[PDB]
Structures are given as C-alpha cells and as structure tokens.
C-alpha cells in the first residue's frame, strides 16, 4: 500500500516554522519518483542521498518536517548555513541524509490585508541542537535587567509575525518547506520503492 503523502503536501494549514509539523512514515512503500516527476516544486535539493537513487533503496523509517518560510531563507535550509531561522527554529545537521522540498503557495498561504497566521522565532539565548523544536515563549532577556516577564527595555519577545501577502516578491512570498529524513539505524527496512 502507498504511504500517505498527498494529504501531507495538500494540507490546508501547514504548521509554523517555530513548531513544525512532524510525521512518521513507516510500514508502507513510498514512491519518491512521483514527487520528482510532478516537478511542482521550485526546490528539489537533496544532500546526503542522490536525487534519483533514493527510490529503489530501502529505508527503515521516514520523518517529514513541514513548515512555511519566506523566499530568501530557502537557501538557509542547508547543512552549515546560519540565520535567525536556520539556527533558532530548525538547525539541519551537517550529516543530513535526506531531502528538502520547497514550493510556492502564495495563493493559499496569503490574502489581502496582511496574513499574520504564520509565526517565526527571532531571538534565542543560545544555539539549538539538530532535530530540536523550541516553542518556549519566555521573554528573551537581552541585558542585565531582569524584566520578569514584562515587555520593555532589554526584553524582546522571541516570536514575531511574518509578512505573507500575495502582492509581494518571490523573496518574501510564503514557501511551503518540508524536510524528509532517512534513518538507517540497526532496524529492518520498512519503506521501499
């Protein structure tokens, strides 16, 4: 039987980048050739595995990490890249062994008047380990003054709002970015092609 992938890509509301939707795919056959042959995505870069020979190989489990970012941070989703989102929201490890898919969705994730439904994390006290989610809303303390949860001087909120609008450029348009991760641990293979 086919692995559930259509409703992942055709989901009505993708999750934000600070809390990305994580799904486990196992005990089925997943044909990644459908995604490549459709070619409905601007980004099909896959480090750690060849863009074509992943289909016939058999893996154990698949992780799908879906989120929405703007245009110019699609480059930031890569091993070794740093940024206010690529480090504070989702840090892809240097030994990434999967693929990342990004496509433009300006007709479904934006509307007139300013779409603020998608958020992002801006300030953090330190870095984050790979495959880690941070939903902490505790006020980032910049200086020595402890504000104790009151917004003010040397205290700014980590989570801001995006700027998704349908009349913007391709560099600030909402792009739906999913991350596929293959684990090759000491487990029998459950997903093939």
């Amino acid at each position, epitope marked *: 039987n086919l692995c559930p992938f259509g409703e992942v890509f055709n989901a009505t509301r993708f999750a934000s980048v600070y809390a990305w939707n*994580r799904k486990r795919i196992s005990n089925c056959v997943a044909d990644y050739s459908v995604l490549y042959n459709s070619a409905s995505f601007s980004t099909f870069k896959c480090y750690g595995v060849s863009p074509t020979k992943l289909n016939d190989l058999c893996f154990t489990n698949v992780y799908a990490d879906s989120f929405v970012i703007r245009g110019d941070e699609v480059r930031q989703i890569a091993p070794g890249q740093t940024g206010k989102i690529a480090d504070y929201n989702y840090k892809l490890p240097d030994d990434f062994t999967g693929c990342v898919i990004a496509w433009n969705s300006n007709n479904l994730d934006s509307k007139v008047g300013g779409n603020y439904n998608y958020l992002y994390r801006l300030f953090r006290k330190s870095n984050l380990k790979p495959f880690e*989610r*941070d*939903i*902490s*809303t505790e006020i980032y303390q910049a200086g020595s003054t402890p504000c104790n*949860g009151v917004e003010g001087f040397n205290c700014y*909120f980590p989570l801001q709002s995006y700027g998704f609008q349908p009349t913007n450029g391709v560099g600030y348009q909402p792009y739906r970015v999913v991350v596929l991760s293959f684990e090759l641990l000491h487990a029998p293979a459950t997903v093939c092609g």
Partner: antibody, heavy 123, light 111 residues
Framework: VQLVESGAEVKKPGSSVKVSCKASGGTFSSYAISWVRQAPGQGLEWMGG????????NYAQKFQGRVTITADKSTSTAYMELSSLRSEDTAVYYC?????????????????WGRGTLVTVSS | SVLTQPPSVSGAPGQRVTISCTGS?????????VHWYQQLPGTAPKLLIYGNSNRPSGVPDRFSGSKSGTSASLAITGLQAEDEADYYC???????????FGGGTKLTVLG
C-alpha cells in the same frame, strides 16, 4: 496565579456566548492562552489559542470558523465568541495556560487552569 | 480521539496500576511529549506529568510517566483514596495540526 471565569448561563439554539477569563495578579503575558472544553462524559479537546502579545490566534479543524477567540492585554483578559450554539455544544469551558519549551519533542502543556464556565443550550 | 486509552482500570490499593496511551505514529511516534493530565471529580484539571518523564511541583512521586515507541505509560506506584480520577494523555498531532487529548481512564479504587 489564579484564573477567574464567568458563571453559568443557559442559552438558546443559534445566538452566541461571551465566555471570558481573568488572571489574578497580572502575569497574562509571555505565555500562550488556550481554551479547552470538557464535554459531559465524552472527553476534552482543544478549541484554539492566542499568543496574547502578538494578537494572532489559531484554531482547530472542527472549530475554525464557528469559534472566535480574542485577547486584550491591557486588562489581562480573553473574550471567547462561540456562535451557532446547538445541543452538543453544551459543556464547560476552561481557559488554560501554555508552557512552551525547547525539549526535542516540545509539546504544548497546560499548567494553570480556570474555574470553568458551564454553558448549556435549552429551548 | 486519535489517542486511545483504556476506558477504565481496576484499582488495587497499595500496588501498581499502569495506564497506557497507544496513539498513532504522527502524534506519539513522531516524537512529541505525552503530557498526562489528571482531573479530580468536580474539580478543574491540572498538569500531572509534563516533559514525558518529568514531574511538576506539587505532584506526588507515585505518578511517573514513560513513553516508548508509539505508546506511553503512566506508573502509579501507590494507590490511595484520592487517586479517584480520569487520566488523559495529550500530544500534538501533525495531520490534525493541533493538540488533542485522549479518551480518559477512570482509575476506580475498590470499596
């Protein structure tokens, strides 16, 4: 802190309610505020939540347009709007706090809970 | 809901009764923490176990949580009179795109 909710009122088919919440001693900030109802004997599920400082809300799939949730940070309160009241909408509503974290999982957990507003629909 | 719990569990005073939450692969098997909630009868619910293994302040040491694979477990080492409650497991889901609770487990101490 403690969260104060309104009393119990009866309602009619159609119409709307204005369930509110109030946090004693302030502290209605840097924390998401979610609303969870307790159905009479069939469990609990999550209506939605707002990050009150940013003023942006999120909802579930079965309650995306039927329910509207608003916040007001000046008086440390949140106003719940529930239009289209039927018979299965009779339940008790709670305003719960959120405690986000960086743990790998990082799942939303409700630390503090309100008193509970019982809303019932009768003809 | 998607998260499945036993409808009720029998209570043996002074022994261990394990409450399980066998969810799907997109909520528990994905990696989200399974937060255990306990509600006293005629009382507002409160956070019993958070972080999937860690205990909030004001929570007795008898209640401990553990999740392996796509199933979670609540350990109750000691069974006293005030443990009469319904236990819910809460986890974030990707397909549902929101936090969902369980079906409840009525821990009924004998008498």
């Amino acid at each position: 802190v403690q969260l104060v909710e309104s009393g119990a009122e009866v309602k009619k088919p159609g119409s709307s309610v204005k369930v509110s919440c109030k946090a004693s001693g302030g502290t209605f900030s840097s924390y998401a505020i979610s609303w969870v109802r307790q159905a009479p004997g069939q469990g609990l599920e999550w209506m939605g939540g707002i990050i009150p400082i940013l003023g942006i809300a999120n909802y579930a799939q079965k309650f995306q347009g039927r329910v509207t949730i608003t916040a007001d940070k000046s008086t440390s309160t949140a106003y719940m709007e529930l239009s289209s009241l039927r018979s299965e909408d009779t339940a008790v509503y709670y305003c719960a706090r959120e405690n986000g974290y960086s743990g790998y999982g990082a799942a939303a957990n409700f630390d503090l809970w309100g008193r509970g507003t019982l809303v019932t629909v009768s003809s | 809901s998607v998260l499945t719990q036993p409808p009720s569990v029998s209570g043996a005073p002074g022994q261990r009764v394990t409450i399980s939450c066998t969810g799907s692969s997109s909520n528990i098997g994905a990696g989200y923490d399974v937060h255990w909630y306990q509600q006293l009868p005629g009382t507002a619910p409160k956070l019993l176990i958070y972080g999937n293994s860690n205990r909030p302040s004001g929570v007795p040491d008898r209640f401990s949580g553990s999740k392996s694979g796509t199933s979670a477990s609540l350990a109750i080492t000691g069974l006293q009179a005030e443990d009469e409650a319904d236990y819910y497991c809460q986890s974030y889901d990707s397909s549902l795109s929101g936090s969902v609770f369980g079906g409840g487990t009525k821990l009924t101490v004998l008498g």
